[PDB]
Each structure stands twice: as C-alpha cells, then as structure tokens.
Write a structure and sequence with these properties.
2 domains; transferase; 643 residues; part of a larger assembly; Rossmann fold; ArnA; Bifunctional polymyxin resistance protein ArnA (chain B); 7-stranded mixed beta sheet; 3 chains; 19 helices; 26 strands
Chain lengths: 643, 325, 636
C-alpha cells in the first residue's frame, strides 16, 4: 500500500517502523519541529530516505494539493499533535487511522497518559481507530489493554503504552493492508474527554485524599514538570511520594513529621520521598524539609480603581457598583463633582480634580498611585467629528495615548473604552471582536476620523500588550442606557446619545428626527447589564479578560430609530408626569446631509457578538427592552424641573 | 519625626508622600499638612513646596541591598538623580537641607570607629555592583558639600545606624531609616520562616532605639548655635554592637516569652547560608560597622540613652501587637 | 570505607552505584544544578537517602568545614565539572581519586570524548587516577582500553565509555577499600591536553580532507550541537556523513550532485546523509539540498568611529592610527580643529563642530549616525576639582552620562575613558581592574569628587551593560605621553599633566617644583604603545573586549617626579634647540598644600584581551616627547 503518515515522538517512530515492517510504502511523513527524551520522527524518516515535512498548518490548500499529488491509499496518524481536518482526510480511499493512548471511548482527549494516572485508573491501553470529523470519536479497529501497576509513573507507563502500540500495530497493520477489518463503533455515552494540562493542573491541594495527591505526583513525575506546592512564598516540587493510610488529628496541610516528611491530607497522609525547593536539585524528603524551613507543625489591601471622567453616567453607576463591594477603593477624576456628588462623603470614594488636557504630572501621579485605570474622557459626539476633527483627535487620541503610556510605564492594568464605531460598515450579522473586518469610507468622508482614531488606539494598546507586557482589556459598549444620562455636550463616554436626544425631544416638545427615515437598526443595553459586565471585567476572575476585546451590548434588544421613537412615545403618553410637558411635535424624516454636516455615511445595522462576554465574564444581558425604556424615561422625566 | 516636631509648638510640618496610611493620626492636626506627591513624577509641585518651606528632609530612596544588584539603574535614578533635583531646589531657593547620607559610604573601611571627618571610604571593584548604592550616596554628599562651599547651601548630613522601634517601614518600601535586619528577623519569627545567617551571621552591627535617633535628628533640625552647619553626623549607638546571630538569639528569646507567642508558628530555626545564595554573585560584605558619635556629642550634646534589651523588647512588642489575628 | 563523592551526569550516577555496590558509605554527594540525556546524580542521591548539595564553589570555607565534619576516608570525583582544589582535597587520609574519560596521560584535558573523535583516534578509554594540583596528572590506579569503531559517534562512544567505567570501577573499587592498589605514575613528556570546545569549533572547512570532516560530524553528532556550514547566507547542519574516496575534478566546496548530496573536499568528497537547514527538521541529504537551494555546481561597510573631543592628543594619534587602516571612517567632534587640522582634507575623516554642554540633538544625532563612540571631553585638572567642583561634576558626569545614554538608546558600542584616579589610595602593588579595592578620603576632602564621579560612571556603564545590553569597554590610561600634548587648561582626556608641566617649566625657565620632595612614583607610557592598545580595543578581535576594564600603561616606566625632572633636564641640556630657552631655574621643594604614593597598573587584562605589551623604553619616550614639544614651540 501507499501511505502518508502524520507522526511525532515515540509512538510516531514505532508507528513508522511497524508500518515499514508491514510492507507499506511511505510516500511522505508529516511531523513537527521540536520544542526547545522522545525519539525523533524526522531523524528516522531522514535515515530511511523518506521525505519529511513540518508545516505549521497542513490544512493549507497547498499541502492538501501536495498530499493529493502523492495519492495515498491509506493514512495513518501516530501522535501527531496538530489537528488534521476532513479536507485532507477524505483523500485516502481505504480511510485514515489514528493511534490513541487510552482505552477508547474513555479518555479520548489529549495527554491520556497523564490523565489516567491523575484519576488513579487501574488500567489503560492503546487504540487504533478510524478518524472522522469528531476528534477520537471514530470506530475502533483494534484495542489492547494494559494494567497500570501501583508503582507505575508517567515514564514507565509511557514505555508500556509504546510496547502495547508496537504489538497492536504489529498484528493489526497486515489486516489493513488487505481489507480485513472489524469496526466496533464507539458508544458515545461511555465517552470521556480531557484537555491539555497546564502546570497549574499539577498544584497539590491538601484537602483532597492522600491517594489522589499520590496519583498527582505519579502522573507528572520526572521527566514531566512535577507536582508542586508552596512553603510561604517559596515553591517546591514533589518528585516521589508515599501514601500513609494511618490518619492524623492534624489539619490538612500541616507537617506531621520531617523525618520522613509527612503532610496531613483530607484523608490519610502523604509522605514526600524526594523533591526540590524551587529550581534547586532533587534531594531526599528530610533534606527538602530542612532547606524549605519546615518543622512540625507548619502549613502550606483594596484595589484602587482610577476613573478618568468620573462625573457622569458610567462614573456614577460604576462607582455605585464598586462601592457596593468591600474590596475596592475608587478614585474619581474630573473637572466637576456634581453628577457623582452623593459619593463625595463616602470613605472609599476620592474625588480628584483634574483635566487630562492641562494636567500632566497630576494624572501620571494618580495612575501610579492606583492599580487599574479607566479612561472615560473623550468626545463621542458625531457632529463634533466633522465640526472639530482636530480637537476630537487631540483629546480622543493624543491625551488618551498619554494616559495609556502612563499605564505602560507604571505597569498598571488599563480597561479601555473602545467603540462600536470601530466596526464601521462591516456587513456581518454579528460584529465579532476577534474576527469581523473593519470598514470605513474614503479620506474625504471625515466622520470616520473618530472610528479610525479609536481603532488605532486599540492597536497601539494591543502592540503594548504583545511587546511591552501591558495588561489591558478593551470593551465596546452598544448604546448603554438607564438613569443619569450624560448631557449631550459632555466629553465623557457611555450614554446613548440617540435616546437622550429623543427623550429631550419629547421633553422639549421638539420633533423626533428620523435620519434618512430612521430605518437603521441599533441595539440597546440596560445600564444594569452593562455595568454588571464592566464590573465583571474589573473583577477579572481567572485573569480571563487579559488581552481580551469584549463587546457589551444586548443583541435581543434591536430597534430602528423609528421603532425607538414609537416605544418611547408610547411610554411617554401613558406616564403620570406627561401633562407637564408639551404636545408631541411628531416624527420628522430628515436627510443625513443636513443634520450631521457633509461627508456622512451611516451604518444600517449594529448587532454585537456577545460570545466573548459570555466566555470571559459568564455574562448575559438579563433586562428586557421595555423595562429599560420605561426606567430610563421615568427617571429622566422625574429629574426635569417643573414650574 | 512628625510626632516629635508636633509635640513642640513652633513647627509646621508638610508631609509629602503617595499615601497617608502610616501617618493617619496626624491628618487632622492643625499644624500637619499632607501633600500628595512622588519625587520621580512631580517637578514643579515639589519645587513649589521647597520654596514654600524652610528646612527640607529628603527621605525617599531604595535602601534594600538585593535591589542594588537586581535593579541598579532604578536605584541610581531614584537615590541619586531625583534627590539631586531636590538638592538643587534647595540651592536655588536658599533653604536648609537635612540630608540622610548612609553608613554604607564607609564601606569596607577598617577603622574601629567610623569617623565622619577622618575615615577613608573603601569600596570594591566596578565588577562588584552592590557598591553602586554606596558610591551613589557618597557622590551626592560630595555634591551637597561642593554647593555648601561654593554656592553657600546650608546643609547637615546624617548617617543613621540601624534605627529601630515601633512602626518599621515595610521591607519593600522606598523610604529611609528602619533597620532591614530587624524587620526581616521579626517577620521571620512572625511568619514562621527560618532566620538566615549569611556566612554564619558573624558580621557585627550597631543598633539604635528610634527614641535616641529621633532625639538626635530633632536636635539637628533645632540647630542650636548653628553648630550643625556644614556638619556630617553619625547617629548610632556604639554600645549596642551585636552580630546578626546574637540578634537572632535575643529576638528569639524575647519572642518565646511574649504573651502573644501562641498566635504564631513554631520557630523554624537558624539556618546558615552562603553569601552567594542569598544576595547572588558579586556580593561584598562589611565585617564591622561601628559609628563615631563624637560629632553628635559636639554638635547636638547628644548621647544614646536606651539599653539594647529595652529596644529589642519594645520593637518586638509593638510589631507583634500590630499583627492581626 | 567512608566517602564524600563529587559527581555529575552518567559517570557520576554509575560511579555512585558502583561505590554503593562495593559497600562504601557515602556520607554526602556534591553535584551541580542542571543547565537548560544524562542521568541525575541528585535524583539518585535522593532515591538512596544520601544528602546531596550543589554549591557553585565547594571550596568556600563553610563547605570545607562541613566536609571535614563528615570526615571521609577517601574522596571520589566522577565527572564533577567545577574544580576541587587541595584544601578540601587533602582532608581524606586515603586520598582522592578521579575518573577520567581518556587514556591518560593522553587527552588529559576536558571533553576528551569529542576530541578523540575530532582527531580520528582508533581507541580511547577510562582512567582512575589519584588527584593532585595539576589537572588529571596524578598516578594511574586503573585503566581500560576501548576500541573506537569507524561508525562511532559521540553518544555511542559515550555509552561505551560509561560501560568501560562501570567495569573498571566494579573490579578496581574493591581494591581501594583495602589498599591493594598499585600506583603507576604518568609519563609527563608523552602527555597531550585539550581545552573546552565552542560550537564555532564545529565549522566545516571544505579545503580539509574528507576524513577530517567526517570525523568532525562524528564528534559533534546529535545530541551534540552538530557540525555546520553555510550555503550563501543560509546556515545548515550536517548530522550524518559518508566519505567518498572517489575524487572529483571539481574544486573544494562545490556541489558535485544533489542526489546524493556530495561536497568536494580537499581530498575525496563528503556525502551529507542527513542534515537540517537552520532550526528546521532533519531530512535526508537530497531533500536538504532541495530546501537549501543547492544545484550541481553550487558553492559555500567601514566602521564609523565617533570621537568627541577630537582636538588634541588622543584625537590626533587615534585618528592617524585609524586612518592608516582601510576599514575606518572617523568623525571628529569638537569646538575647534586647530590641533587636528592635517586630517581635515582626508576623505575618511569628518570634522563635526559641536559642544556637548550646549548641543544635545547634534550630539545624539551623531551618536546615532556612528557605530563606536569615544567620549574624550572632561576636566581632568586637579586644581579644578576643588576650584570648580560643580562644573567638573556637570561636565565629567552629567553630560557624559547623557552621551552614555545616547549609546544605550541607539545600541552603539561605547569605549569610555575611566581614570587611574579611580583606584585612589589603594595599597595593592599592582592596580587591578577586576580585583583592587578603591579607597578615597572623607567627603570633606573634595579633591576626590573627580575620582568618585568617574567611578560611579563606570558603575552606571556597567549596569547598562548588565541590564540593558550596552556594549562597552572601559580603559584607564596611565600617564600617556608623546607628541602633541594637550594644553594644560584643555577639557580633553589623555595627556600626562606632570610631563607637560615639567616641559613647560624647562621651556619657560621656571623652576621644577617637587611637591613634598617629589618622591612619589608614577608610571608613564609612550603614546605609540597606548594608542596601539586603544586601537586594539577599537578592533575588538574575537569580541574579547566586551564588558572589559583595561588599564593601558607601562609598569616598567615607573619614575618619581624628581627622576623625571632629572631625565628631562638631561635630554633638555643636550638638545639642538636648547639655546632658545632660559637657564634652568632649579629644583624647588614644596609643601603639600600650595596624594597617591604609587600608581602601578596591572596590564594583565590588556595582555589577555589585546595581546598587547608596551614595547618602548622610557628614554626614547622622554626624548621624543621633549623633542616634538621643543620643536613645536613658537620662537621670537
């Protein structure tokens, strides 16, 4: 037969060897470059005069074409780490087979070797199965069980698995060369799947049974990175352990004895036979105890948030939210305190007077003084994009860049308000932070200066993230609304201008202007939801927001400006305070080339993808449109001075 | 110092720093003023406050040895350059500067008593970088001196020797004056980590109760008879000489008998470590540091009044009493 | 018996195992931490319940004491990489033995495994010998030969060595537990020694015989770094090779065929069986040929020197020296050209007008423009330290620090003039750049402001070298002298002021002042030697000057001011131009106020880094300096 082989490490080597011994013709071999003990597939392929390649992505059309040219009869994958998807798989008529390191369907994930030790399994094996769209889900052609001894660790079991693999291939490869095959389909309800282990998966938690921890140290034992714990600030690794079923009244984590070194667990105790302190050499347990400073018995302030532009919508709601919790200290920075005035007396709120266009060192100082930074000062007003581009640019780009650079210099986390305007004219049904293209008009359409300015800032922050180690999170709000809207002339981020304008229309008795008919659709978000999300970003559980760009918006809330007008009007007409305000002037359709000045181009739809918000924040918008409309309108109408 | 100055009625204190937490009880005092600032960031705000005030006390600096080798350029930038900026403010506006020099300028000097006016100053080769702190500080003293001689700057330099008492600085703090050895050992006893004796901890240091030290410093500020003008003054207690080991033993002894002991872990023990382990390579240590207090007696009519044991006991007591249980 | 073992790697492991199997009691094991195949001595020690330590230097007094407390009968060294010297060595009464990977006395150096392959040796072995002051020189207790097969590579031979060592130890260790050993002294005139290999030693030179090259790839074969060569700019590694006795008319280095890949050598041709392109994967020769772009027949600017303060002594002579050579472009920067005027028309000299106290961007610009930077501007005049300390500090420290930071920012090499005064009152017979302590007086002795300023600069430059990767070399001149001395009031570094002063005294007819009797001795250097050294520093052959501090001076030229006076006067009186100057005013003894007792450089670093020694005797220096000076003086 003719074969194209995908191979890496020992399984790859033995696979290729078994394949050759079975009389296969290997046309080419695909493998990986070596990361900075295992046998080399490349060296082996080279010795046998077999062409060997190591592309980053084999699924690139070129490689598909090349593999197609080789015209293989059957494909084999032995421990190839990168994923081969159907386009290439369907090239071999006899099919494609994969060698997996467990008893399938159990442990069909990756690193089965380690996982079966972690879970304390009494047996495992090797499986040759028929690849398919679902990873390791295909029909089992052959399988062989091997017992896991109590004294087996990762490396010894690895060698047993390799042996079993040679045997399996040795007997079943000739069967494939003919067409003698059974397929025992996998039972999906018996399936178990595990992902890639991170060293953090090896952290020893002493409240668990000693058996589980023993299994932990068995699973990651040398050559693997090893299981670890801490003495005070000092990290240490347990290379070999011994379970002591005899219990102890000592609490979990306490040192029962240093000779031998014995840690009390939730059930039983764990003896540390060998280990090391930090990057030092391995030593016997007692010596490790001595160098770590253990003896019998031994066991194992508030965040400063700087809000620039605090006087206003986001400042108010975020401050309220943050002060609800016990672990935050809020520094509001702005040129006036009125909108936030009720927090001025609060012990954990600090108003800082400042202007980011004038003050330099005062700002820098406060960035250094605090932990996380929230730059809300900017001109978000569309008419100003065209009316005062240079001022918009100076404030929105340059001053904020000054602040970003402070954040880079003093190594502080920046949570930066990017804008939904960045997507521009993108045609996707859902605007995706990580995927969607960004479309703007020609230079002669200047309204885009705001969109492009914010985009470039996002990219500079990104660059700082990659190259200089800036901790950042970008968030893009979609028409946040609720109580305490920003004034329309205000230089702060966050209140939907449209709804503010419409409400102001109803309050002033001026018409609701539908620009080009108001057929363009927008998504609206209750500030309860938005601020929840933003608070979740500040919390940064599991550091899952690091380097992330997160849309915050409600896609289920979708309306044209016209529909919005009608909803608000409906809530307005039935409101108790209605009679204090003028008659409705009506809706008035107006062309774009009047209201926004010239060079205007409007987006027909803006619908956020909230996938990232769900992934990072475990967040979903909970508030229905109607309640948002009603609360917003009510609060606004009740603030109006009547006389 | 704030406490001492505010006890007397004729001082107005402007405290400058990036946080008030350690001094919080002085914030309401009519004659204390907390001013927000950082000497690496602020230029004009600092300059203004120098013009506004009379005598100036620049305590901001990185005194922690590991950082000399680990972050030499920041040590140099903060301890030398920013402070030179401040000194030059004082020169410009004709203000008195009381400057915290370091006992480390003497370095490896072999004299039995380190003498401000006499002892030679000994450092290692350039390839022994820990000395960057000592030499940086020395060169400032010389610049301040030059300004004194040529431009008429009114100055007093003082070198504290292991001041200790209540309210020690945190070990990572960029402010001058509390002994790191004492902080480290007490924190060791509190955290239940072992006390490391570097190369056996046989090197001897002199320790000073903060009451005596602050008396001296206050007397320097007083400047009775203008006797401190152009003077360099050691502030230390030479009778309090002890090795780090002995210090460990004393502290341990005081610790075991303390009423609050049972709230803290068992003693991990003294553990001998090589110099190359703790401080890394290129380390060079001082075998003895004993101050001459002659100048202090002459200028301040000052002598240390406090016995070692009372200092040890009070320092430990206060620290343990502050710990949250 | 009781033993303390010094062990590393496979030899360490098998050594220890054999030791235990022989009934020895191992009290402790000393080993190393692992740098980024071998068995772990630590892991083994840990499993066997033996205390194990890994200090960087075990000869530290503490560890000696600790080993003494352990009180070993005999000591064993199995492939311990750090060097154990006698103090600890003599603690064990039965002595200390070392296991070495060659047939001693031959290949007694380090990395014998690789060397015996490089040299194409047909045999090697393992030797157990007694330790002593000379490395691997002691009496041979046991030895076992090993045949090297033609197809052996490093790893296979390594395992053969390990097996042979295991046998050797198995039979001869029991004898040592008793004292039933013979000691056969090594024949010292038959000995051969090799040093540590660097990957650059594995470069394939195609003019050599195919045999040597085959052996080359055999010596460093995987897991080792491998033998390598270049196709144009692209580097490639040869993992396995085959000698072809069949000749080719093709000249050495050309590609005869791509399938197999065959390179013509000086004798025979070498087939590349497997190899890799750069960091890519191993592949058979033909594919390697294709991916490297080989076919049948294929084969295998000036440095810009910026001198700030060029107008003067070092500027003149360094410029002359640099322009003599073909590969330098010199940019002289200063406030006047008067002293360097003869170079103004030279195509490769460029005078740039500038003042480092005023000009900032012009200076920064020229630092960016150039490659290597030489900051010679500073006030070196002693009276000025005390007379104008602040100006001295401003110019010598702050402005030069700005320049250093330009060099750090634009990643340029800086060759910086430190000062001999940095040593100050140091009492050592030879002032050592790397060792001597630096001693200065109290703050109230302001003359030291200069010395300490220059020192702190050396330390900042050092830090930038360590933390930000600045390429630098510091040099400390000791009384350079020759033609074209700097003026005494000049802000440039490098001319000995004393000689200038004495010569000016003889020229002006003023007395030669011997301060405190002029018994204090100084070392003087002809500028030919000095500028040679400095030029060698600019060259930076083998990058041996990186991070180095190098005294440039002549210790043979030591003389007191009195003797110097006597010499200059002697040369003066007999000079053809003597009649143009007044009678000698005489020697006059003076009080201190109106110092260093000896200044003698260690030139070891200059020798090591520059392969440099001063060739010129004192008298010619005195005579030439005085001659040029007197002939230079304007008369009327």
């Amino acid at each position: 037969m003719k074969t194209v082989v995908f191979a890496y490490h020992d399984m790859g080597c033995l696979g290729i060897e078994a394949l050759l011994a079975a009389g296969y013709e290997i046309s080419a071999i695909f493998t990986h470059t070596d990361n900075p003990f295992y046998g080399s597939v490349a060296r082996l392929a080279a010795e046998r005069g077999i062409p060997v390649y190591a592309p980053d992505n084999v699924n690139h059309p070129l490689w598909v074409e090349r593999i197609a040219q080789l015209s293989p009869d059957v494909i084999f994958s032995f421990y190839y780490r990168h994923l081969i998807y159907d386009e290439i798989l369907q090239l071999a008529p006899a099919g494609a087979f994969n060698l997996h390191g467990s008893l399938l369907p159990k442990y069909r994930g990756r690193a089965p070797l380690n996982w079966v030790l972690v879970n304390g399994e009494t047996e495992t094996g090797v499986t040759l199965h028929r690849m398919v769209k679902r990873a390791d889900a295909g029909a089992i052609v052959a399988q062989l069980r091997i017992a896991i001894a109590p004294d087996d660790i990762a490396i010894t079991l690895h060698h047993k698995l390799c042996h079993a693999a040679r045997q399996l291939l040795e007997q079943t490869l000739p069967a494939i060369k003919h067409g003698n095959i059974l397929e025992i389909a996998q039972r999906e309800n018996e399936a178990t799947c595990f992902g890639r282990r991170t060293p953090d998966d090896s952290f020893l938690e002493w409240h668990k049974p000693a058996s589980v921890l023993h299994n932990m140290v068995r699973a990651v034992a040398d050559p693997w990175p090893g299981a670890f714990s801490y003495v005070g600030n000092q990290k240490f690794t347990v290379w070999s352990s011994r379970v002591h079923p005899h219990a102890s009244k000592a609490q979990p984590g306490s040192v029962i004895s240093v000779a031998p070194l014995l840690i009390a667990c939730g059930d039983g105790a764990l003896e540390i036979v060998t280990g090391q302190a930090g990057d030092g050499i391995t030593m016997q347990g007692s010596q490790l105890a001595q160098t770590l400073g253990l003896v019998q018995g031994s066991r194992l302030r508030r965040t400063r948030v700087l809000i620039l532009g605090v006087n206003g919508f986001i400042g108010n709601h975020l401050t309220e939210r943050l002060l609800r919790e016990d672990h935050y200290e809020v520094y509001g920075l702005d040129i006036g305190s009125d909108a936030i005035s009720r927090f001025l007396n609060h012990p954990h709120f600090h108003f800082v007077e400042g202007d980011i266009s004038i003050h330099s060192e005062w700002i820098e100082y406060h960035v250094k003084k605090c932990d996380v930074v929230l730059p809300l000062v900017a001109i978000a007003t569309p008419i100003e994009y065209t009316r005062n581009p240079l001022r918009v640019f100076e404030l929105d780009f340059e001053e904020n860049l000054r602040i970003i650079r402070y954040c880079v210099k003093y190594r502080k986390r920046i949570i930066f308000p990017s804008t939904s305007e960045v997507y521009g004219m993108c045609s996707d049904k859902y605007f995706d932070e990580d995927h969607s293209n960004l479309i703007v008009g020609p230079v002669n359409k200047p309204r885009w200066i705001y969109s492009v300015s914010k985009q470039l800032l996002d990219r500079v922050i990104w660059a700082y993230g990659e190259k200089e180690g800036l901790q950042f999170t970008l968030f893009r709000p979609f028409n946040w609304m609720g109580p305490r809207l920003d004034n329309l002339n205000a230089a702060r981020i966050g209140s939907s201008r449209a709804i503010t304008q419409l409400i102001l229309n109803l309050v002033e008795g001026s018409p609701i202007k539908l620009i080009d008919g108001g057929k363009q659709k927008r998504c609206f978000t209750d500030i309860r939801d938005g601020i929840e999300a933003l608070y979740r970003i500040i919390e940064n559980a599991g550091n899952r927001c690091d380097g992330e760009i997160i849309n915050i918006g409600n896609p289920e809330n979708e309306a044209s400006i016209e529909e919005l007008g009608e909803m608000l009007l409906a809530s307005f007409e039935k409101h108790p305070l209605r009679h204090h305000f003028p008659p409705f002037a009506g809706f008035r359709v107006v062309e774009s080339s009047s209201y926004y000045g010239k060079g205007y181009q409007d987006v027909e739809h803006r619908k956020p993808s909230i996938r990232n918000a769900h992934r990072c924040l475990d967040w979903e918008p909970k508030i229905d449109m109607q309640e948002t409309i009603d609360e917003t309108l009510d609060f606004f109408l009740r603030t109006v001075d009547l006389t």
